[PDB]
Design a binder for this molecule. Structure first.
Ligand code: NA
Length: 129
């Protein structure tokens, strides 16, 4: 599924991301925009044997198990295929873990490069929340 901006914002709000660990909703929407272009099926296969999965491009070395990645930790305790669903629940639950495991949103390269320091409220402006 390719989400709309406001539709994704509402889904992320329903799942408790607004102000999760001090990150406003627009940060999460911005991260998804630049990680995956709002596409739940996005995959990026890296040369290091790992793969980034889903709307938040969560990597298979630390966070989910795909059976193919060296050094797997599976800290979210999920198969990576769960991150390719049309429903965002598994991606949101794992994203919450990423931040709870002592990372901030700097764990997402697209957040740090394209969202940090910007007016991230723009990403939820005009939306029914
Ligand atoms: Na996309």
């Amino acid at each position: 599924k390719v989400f709309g901006r406001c539709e994704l914002a509402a889904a992320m709000k329903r799942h408790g991301l607004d102000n999760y660990r001090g990150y406003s909703l627009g940060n999460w929407v911005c991260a998804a925009k630049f990680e995956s272009n709002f596409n739940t099926q996005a995959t990026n296969r890296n040369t290091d044997g790992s793969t980034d999965y889903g709307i938040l491009q969560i990597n298979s070395r630390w966070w989910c198990n795909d059976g193919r990645t060296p050094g797997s930790r599976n800290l979210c305790n999920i198969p990576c295929s769960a991150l390719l669903s049309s429903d965002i629940t598994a991606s949101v639950n794992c994203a919450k873990k990423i931040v709870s495991d002592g990372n901030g949103m700097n764990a997402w390269v697209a957040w740090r490069n394209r969202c940090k320091g910007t007016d991230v409220q723009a990403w939820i402006r005009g939306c029914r929340l």
